[PDB]
Amino acid sequence: DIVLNPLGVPSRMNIGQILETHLGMAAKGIGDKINAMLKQQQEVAKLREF
Amino acid sequence: ARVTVQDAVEKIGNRFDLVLVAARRARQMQVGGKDPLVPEENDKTTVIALREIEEGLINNQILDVRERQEQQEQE
Amino acid sequence: GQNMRVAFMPWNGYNFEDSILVSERVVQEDRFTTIHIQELACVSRDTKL
Amino acid sequence: EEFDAIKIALASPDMIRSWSFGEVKKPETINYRTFKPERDGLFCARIFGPVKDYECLCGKYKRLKHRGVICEKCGVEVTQTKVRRERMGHIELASPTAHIWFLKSLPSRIGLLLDMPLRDIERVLYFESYVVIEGGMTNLERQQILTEEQYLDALEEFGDEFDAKMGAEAIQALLKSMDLEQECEQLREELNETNSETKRKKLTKRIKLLEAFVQSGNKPEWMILTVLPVLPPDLRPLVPLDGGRFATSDLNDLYRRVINRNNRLKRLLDLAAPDIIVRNEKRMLQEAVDALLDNGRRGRAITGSNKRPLKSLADMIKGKQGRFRQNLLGKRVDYSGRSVITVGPYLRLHQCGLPKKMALELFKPFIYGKLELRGLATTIKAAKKMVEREEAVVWDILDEVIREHPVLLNRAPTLHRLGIQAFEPVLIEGKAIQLHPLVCAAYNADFDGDQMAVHVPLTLEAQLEARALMMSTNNILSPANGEPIIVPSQDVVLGLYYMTRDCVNAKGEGMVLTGPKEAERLYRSGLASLHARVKVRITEYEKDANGELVAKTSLKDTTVGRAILWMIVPKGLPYSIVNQALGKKAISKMLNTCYRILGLKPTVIFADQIMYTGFAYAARSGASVGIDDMVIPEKKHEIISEAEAEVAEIQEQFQSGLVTAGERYNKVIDIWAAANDRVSKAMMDNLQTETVINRDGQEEKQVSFNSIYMMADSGARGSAAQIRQLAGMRGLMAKPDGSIIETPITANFREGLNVLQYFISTHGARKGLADTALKTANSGYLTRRLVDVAQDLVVTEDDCGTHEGIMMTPVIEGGDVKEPLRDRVLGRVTAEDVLKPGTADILVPRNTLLHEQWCDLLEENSVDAVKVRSVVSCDTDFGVCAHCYGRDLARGHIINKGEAIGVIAAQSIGEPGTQLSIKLSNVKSVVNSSGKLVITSRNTELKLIDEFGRTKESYKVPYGAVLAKGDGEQVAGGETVANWDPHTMPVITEVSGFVRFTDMIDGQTITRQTDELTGLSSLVVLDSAERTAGGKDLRPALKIVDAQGNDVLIPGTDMPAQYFLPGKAIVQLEDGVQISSGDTLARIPQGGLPRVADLFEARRPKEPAILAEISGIVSFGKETKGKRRLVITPVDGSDPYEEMIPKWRQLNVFEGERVERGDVISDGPEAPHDILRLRGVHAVTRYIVNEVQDVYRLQGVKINDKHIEVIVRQMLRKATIVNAGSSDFLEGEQVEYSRVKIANRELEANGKVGATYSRDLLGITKASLATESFISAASFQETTRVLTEAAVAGKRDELRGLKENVIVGRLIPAGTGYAYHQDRMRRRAAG
Amino acid sequence: EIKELLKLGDLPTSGQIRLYDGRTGEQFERPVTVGYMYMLKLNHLVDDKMHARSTGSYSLVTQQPLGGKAQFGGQRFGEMEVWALEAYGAAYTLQEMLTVKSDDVNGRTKMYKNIVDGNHQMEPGMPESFNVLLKEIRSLGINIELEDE
DNA sequence: GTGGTGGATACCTCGTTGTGGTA
DNA sequence: TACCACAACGAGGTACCTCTCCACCAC
RNA sequence: GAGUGGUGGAGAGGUA
Ligand SMILES: [Mg+2]
Ligand SMILES: [Zn+2]
Ligand SMILES: [Zn+2]
């Protein structure tokens, strides 16, 4: 959705956006697995376990 | 000269004299309605006058003797 | 703000010197359309006529 | 309507009346119900003309047919309404009053005119004391100020013979009675008897005042106002607020106050009030009119009704928002848009994307004209509504109007010259101006919300100027240095680096290709990657000596990416340009090489193509950053642990009490900086050489494809310091007090700091972001000061014909070559030939422009130094010639006549203020008994010659310092022969023999003491400040003699072998010893931007290095005082010179040696005043240029030196007179050097003696104010001062500078308008 | 901890994935970093920022055009930009930007009428702010005038 | 509405330039 | 009478955008 | 003889 500029990072030294980008992708990976489990409608026990 | 006028700079010798003689020619085309001797290809009078000087049908003394010639045949 | 998918790469110059290139689907989902409520006033003054 | 000089002088009351159109006689401004002005009020239409257009007040006449008549019922004159802002009023003041500019603009000109103190004149005009005008008795002398008790005592004493008055009428009568020619004759006869400095200065100030008055024809009575004029009413206007409440200007209130108090004084004068009451009202009237002329000047500024001080006439003229610098130099302008900028990569070099809406608004009358020309529009209203309906015919007409009609994309702050560039616009939808990515380095634009303006040119002259002068494809090279400003920047650079770099065995390496076409076919098909090392057949084109193009062809062992870029590179360049990996510096050198090889057309189209392919291949790489891409060197914590262990050991040894606090703290500093260097080195190694997993030769080690290292290595963004702060160690941050914190930030921006390290980092952050505020403010003030010094300079002559100039060497000081001869001398025009063999005995002719070929041949011949024509050496009045200037950087060829050099140099100096064998010379020496060579002179400097004959390095050696080598030998590197005593200065001799301790007796000049370590007696000499009565009149001398006692004669001179030693000398040698030649005798112990501003303002520094003033032998002249006078007596003439030295300030030279004209006496920084005064102009220019380029070289800023030479040439315009000849110059007059030059020219033309002079170096501020163009000085600074002095002298301005021709509103005498100005001035001289 | 979370998500642990190119279909050569950053939208909107002016209102004291997007005024062509035009040498552009595009009423009326008629020609004149300065010094009490020739 | 109008804060930092004081 | 503290004036960045707030008195 | 008022000035905040 947004193609940012990679050269904004190394000189301006805001590595918080890089770590936040990785952590955001992890958050959406978990949310996508939960959305997959709900759209397949697997199990309330499998939801509780995950 | 439609992107770089350095050929007209080499033809004249100086940017300010280039601007002055091209302004003289463009004023002659917009007031007097004289015909641009280069084919115009749907351009404005300033770039037409720069292209005229860039080709070499007009310099400062050429325009001066031309205006003096039309002056003496008018009088 | 809204959180949205981000790739970090040069893209044909269109993100050059702190610039951002935004997909169509950000506009199509209307993720960033704010509302601006503006006040215009009218007063009936009193001239001496 | 055609004036050619602005003449200014004082205003007679008759002149003020003849301006006027009727006396205002009532403080009522207008009415409150029927809003017409009153009769004789502050807006009275009978005085200041009509209100409507071609009307009267009663509405009788309503038409142009009554062109000008007088309405009999109102008294008004029907004209147009233009005369409402061009008629003036006058006020009949009852009492005379004092113009406050001539009372409080220091010096007041009345305090110097009447030779009376300002306190006494202030007490007179405060109505507190009387002054007698004339007195026949002997008790009261003329101009004797009396108090009121003394006044009434004079009344009861005489009362009839004298006349003592109080107030402005007293000083008015005194100004009438003072006789100008008689008192100036009295001054001229009273000056010449004695010449004391301060009184002589005041006397010549008064003679200049009186001579200026009698020259100008002003009257000294005219300083006292009797008829005060009134401004036109439409320049102190009265528009109300939205709710009917009327909000005025300040001037209506000030005029109301002075008119009301004038009416009350009129009532009290015809009422014949008591004298105390009428003098109190005269006091209040005087204070009101002084408030009106300058509110915040005399005393308490009268505040307005809204708790703010009122604005006076002086506060409406002068200021940062005065009339000059607010509405004359910079005007708000029509035909101008503004928008947020964005990036257009799809453009070309001359195009910008104007939005539809802004372009339809900006070109609105052009659209009207094309609509009427195409027969669709017949009237202006139909054209207006056809544009405001926005039809498709209007969009087509706009698309035809825009076609090749440029627009000027200004960006403010427009610091340097290239902040305005003209582009041919292309139409886009949207709402944001698109720029090229090449011009946003010239603009210093970042597309994060920067806004830019769009100014249109209208006339044909302006469209041709914006095409042929201000196009983006004409200012390729900056005028600060001939290195191009269209450099690719960070993204094109990442793409071209990723193109032209090579791996080891990537994909399809070792193939053989027909050329770039087949190679790019391979890469787009994907059968070979961009980093395979292949062989290609390249048909490169060598351009010969003339403009012919031969075609050679061979096989090159290159990369596929280099073979693809060679398709872009035009015909005329070699291949080694592209054959390596291309960083940013290599790409800029590509563009510069292409420029000086081919020209201006292929370099432009090559720069556009190189931007296109750089963007495309950067996108096809995908250079992304991750958190694994910042690799931390895995041996960081181990060396950190060893560093903290050893610093804990040093802290424990301190707490035990072995070492001290300062040495412990410095030990912590060096330990942590050494560990920081180790971690940074391991980090850069562990980042640089990491792609080692390879094959097909072996496990090979190469440079890495790491993304952070690639973006830092190509020159794209950030450097090794920022990479170190990311990955390695953040380092030792500083407290704000200039200290270094003990514990460093041992973390970085990947592991993340803790609280304390982040709180430490905020110190440097806030110090940087307040540093930017003070830096930008002071840089802007330096830029404006340099601009308004350097206005008056243009190219005027084609050649001044001189042969003088600066001997130009490559600067070599310190330890390293600072600038090569190429970057020093390239562009100049050679003053003389090169008279040295070198390699081929080259003799280039004088008056020769230094091309790159000529620079290459002089570099090959290795000429040591060249004399070139400098701008400060030119011999043309009012501007400098072309050949003394040299190369204009933005065009490559010589300077075309007319181009304003001074504003170019001012912008290019003041713009980076936001960025901010052996050889012996001058040697008199002797080999001692040990062979270790000492030096007996002061101005000896040791040189390091090369085996070619040129210079490697240069060092200054102090007097008496030791030297291990002889002359001519070739000592290898690593040998530091610099051997010096760090604390003491030796006083060595040069003859041999025995010592007789004469002229030193224990008790009054030497102290008997013994050293506490060796037991040997030492006769140390005590200073003359603590001596007895017998030591205040004699200098001790070590009479060094031979073995029997004869004072031997030094061969060459006739002076005896004595050594007048000063105090604090530790004499350790005793009697009966042998003294060598050169052995020791005794011991005597010891920013950037304000630096540039202090050098240019020409200030005397805090510790002036005292220098000598004449040649000869030096001795002491006055004793019995701590101010030691020094008689520097010449070897041929007498000495008129002495000097006062402070007590704590030491002396470095001795009274036995002979100095030259202008020797260094005392050490430290030295003032440019005395530098000029003893050395001369070429030396002071060399000093100023080297000392400013030191700052601009430390921060890494490229500036050609002729800019600083131009600024010094503008600093050196004046010249004061040491002796008159036959011309009309009296003595010591700070006059312009051009007038003295033409006066001596005509005096030698008709055969006269000529006038001598002396150049003087004024600073920026004093120079630009001392400029005789009073419009220029008044637009710069101190407006009340310069207007007062110009009005007194009756000056006129010749209107020859760009600032006054911009104020007045003609073409400037530069650029295009220079031809018109020389034509107009030869027409005006020709009739 | 973030790499543990990514391994829970069945993602590449470094965060970098291998993006393609939607333009030409093919692959980017090197792995690209992709995630979800929280983008704001600030209060600097381009509709409030963009403003243009051809011919509009004028001040009362100096007869030069107004300033500000509300009053439809023009951009101040300041002192630094005057030095930029000076050091270029565009004397005609500087003169037409200080007289007919600005505070000179007769010259700007002839300019507007001439541009509508199609001929771009310039008749200059003394600026109204300079006349204001003349009236202000003359009312201050110092005789300043324009001496002919 | 239409002429009249005088008092109870301090908190820059150089840097020239002019002025009374004194060895 | 030539140094000298001391006092007084005179500088201190350009361009832009948004908002609110505007003398008392008085027979 | 054919519509119309902020600039003026202060204060506060913001952008580059
Ligand atoms: Mg920015
Ligand atoms: Zn009337
Ligand atoms: Zn010269």
Side-chain angles (χ1 to χ4, degrees), chain D residues 799-802 869-871 873-876 880-885:
Chain D
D799 205 358
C800 72
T802 194
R869 300 186 38 168
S870 89
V871 175
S873 45
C874 177
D875 207 359
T876 294
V880 300
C881 70
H883 285 99
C884 274
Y885 185 46

Short mmCIF file of all heavy atoms in Angstrom, two decimals, chain D residues 799-802 869-871 873-876 880-885, ligand 3:
data_model
loop_
_atom_site.label_atom_id
_atom_site.label_comp_id
_atom_site.label_asym_id
_atom_site.label_seq_id
_atom_site.Cartn_x
_atom_site.Cartn_y
_atom_site.Cartn_z
N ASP D 799 39.58 45.63 -20.42
CA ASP D 799 40.89 45.32 -19.88
C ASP D 799 41.48 46.59 -19.28
O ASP D 799 41.43 47.65 -19.90
CB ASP D 799 41.83 44.77 -20.95
CG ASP D 799 42.92 43.90 -20.37
OD1 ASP D 799 42.97 43.77 -19.13
OD2 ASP D 799 43.71 43.34 -21.15
N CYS D 800 42.05 46.47 -18.08
CA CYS D 800 42.69 47.61 -17.46
C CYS D 800 44.17 47.72 -17.80
O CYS D 800 44.80 48.72 -17.45
CB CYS D 800 42.52 47.56 -15.94
SG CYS D 800 43.48 46.29 -15.13
N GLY D 801 44.73 46.71 -18.45
CA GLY D 801 46.07 46.81 -19.01
C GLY D 801 47.22 46.71 -18.03
O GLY D 801 48.37 46.82 -18.44
N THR D 802 46.94 46.50 -16.74
CA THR D 802 48.03 46.45 -15.78
C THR D 802 48.74 45.10 -15.84
O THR D 802 48.31 44.17 -16.52
CB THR D 802 47.52 46.71 -14.37
OG1 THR D 802 48.64 46.97 -13.51
CG2 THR D 802 46.78 45.50 -13.83
N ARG D 869 46.30 37.97 -12.48
CA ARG D 869 45.61 39.24 -12.31
C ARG D 869 44.46 39.08 -11.33
O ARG D 869 43.58 38.24 -11.54
CB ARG D 869 45.11 39.74 -13.65
CG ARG D 869 46.21 39.96 -14.65
CD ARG D 869 45.70 40.58 -15.92
NE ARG D 869 44.68 41.57 -15.65
CZ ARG D 869 44.23 42.43 -16.56
NH1 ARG D 869 44.73 42.41 -17.78
NH2 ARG D 869 43.29 43.30 -16.23
N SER D 870 44.47 39.87 -10.27
CA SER D 870 43.44 39.80 -9.25
C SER D 870 42.55 41.03 -9.31
O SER D 870 42.92 42.08 -9.83
CB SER D 870 44.05 39.70 -7.85
OG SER D 870 44.28 41.00 -7.34
N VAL D 871 41.36 40.88 -8.72
CA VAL D 871 40.34 41.92 -8.78
C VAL D 871 40.74 43.11 -7.93
O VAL D 871 40.46 44.26 -8.29
CB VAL D 871 39.00 41.31 -8.35
CG1 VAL D 871 37.90 42.34 -8.27
CG2 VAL D 871 38.61 40.21 -9.32
N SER D 873 43.66 44.28 -7.70
CA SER D 873 44.76 44.95 -8.37
C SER D 873 44.32 45.77 -9.57
O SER D 873 45.16 46.43 -10.19
CB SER D 873 45.80 43.93 -8.81
OG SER D 873 45.17 42.81 -9.41
N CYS D 874 43.03 45.74 -9.92
CA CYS D 874 42.56 46.37 -11.14
C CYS D 874 42.64 47.89 -11.04
O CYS D 874 42.65 48.47 -9.95
CB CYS D 874 41.12 45.96 -11.44
SG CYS D 874 40.43 46.76 -12.89
N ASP D 875 42.71 48.53 -12.20
CA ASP D 875 42.98 49.95 -12.30
C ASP D 875 41.84 50.68 -12.98
O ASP D 875 42.04 51.70 -13.65
CB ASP D 875 44.29 50.19 -13.04
CG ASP D 875 44.95 51.48 -12.65
OD1 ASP D 875 44.38 52.20 -11.80
OD2 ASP D 875 46.03 51.78 -13.19
N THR D 876 40.62 50.19 -12.81
CA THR D 876 39.45 50.81 -13.40
C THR D 876 38.60 51.42 -12.31
O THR D 876 38.26 50.75 -11.33
CB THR D 876 38.64 49.80 -14.22
OG1 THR D 876 39.42 49.38 -15.34
CG2 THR D 876 37.36 50.42 -14.73
N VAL D 880 35.43 46.72 -12.04
CA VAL D 880 36.68 46.10 -12.42
C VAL D 880 36.56 45.54 -13.83
O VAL D 880 35.47 45.27 -14.32
CB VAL D 880 37.09 45.00 -11.42
CG1 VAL D 880 37.26 45.60 -10.05
CG2 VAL D 880 36.05 43.92 -11.37
N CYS D 881 37.70 45.38 -14.48
CA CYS D 881 37.68 44.93 -15.86
C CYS D 881 37.50 43.42 -15.94
O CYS D 881 37.40 42.73 -14.92
CB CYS D 881 38.96 45.34 -16.59
SG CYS D 881 40.44 44.47 -16.05
N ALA D 882 37.45 42.91 -17.16
CA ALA D 882 37.16 41.50 -17.34
C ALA D 882 38.38 40.63 -17.09
O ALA D 882 38.27 39.59 -16.43
CB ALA D 882 36.63 41.24 -18.75
N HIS D 883 39.53 41.03 -17.61
CA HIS D 883 40.73 40.21 -17.51
C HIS D 883 41.27 40.15 -16.09
O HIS D 883 41.97 39.19 -15.75
CB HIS D 883 41.80 40.71 -18.46
CG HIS D 883 41.55 40.38 -19.89
ND1 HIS D 883 41.01 41.28 -20.78
CD2 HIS D 883 41.77 39.24 -20.59
CE1 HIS D 883 40.90 40.72 -21.97
NE2 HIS D 883 41.36 39.48 -21.88
N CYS D 884 40.97 41.13 -15.25
CA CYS D 884 41.33 41.01 -13.85
C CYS D 884 40.36 40.13 -13.09
O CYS D 884 40.68 39.70 -11.98
CB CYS D 884 41.40 42.39 -13.20
SG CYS D 884 43.01 43.17 -13.38
N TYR D 885 39.19 39.84 -13.64
CA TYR D 885 38.27 38.93 -12.97
C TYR D 885 38.53 37.49 -13.39
O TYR D 885 38.75 36.62 -12.54
CB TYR D 885 36.83 39.32 -13.26
CG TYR D 885 35.83 38.49 -12.50
CD1 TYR D 885 36.00 38.24 -11.16
CD2 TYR D 885 34.73 37.94 -13.14
CE1 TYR D 885 35.10 37.48 -10.47
CE2 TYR D 885 33.83 37.18 -12.44
CZ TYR D 885 34.03 36.95 -11.11
OH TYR D 885 33.14 36.19 -10.41
ZN ZN I 3 41.69 45.07 -14.03
#
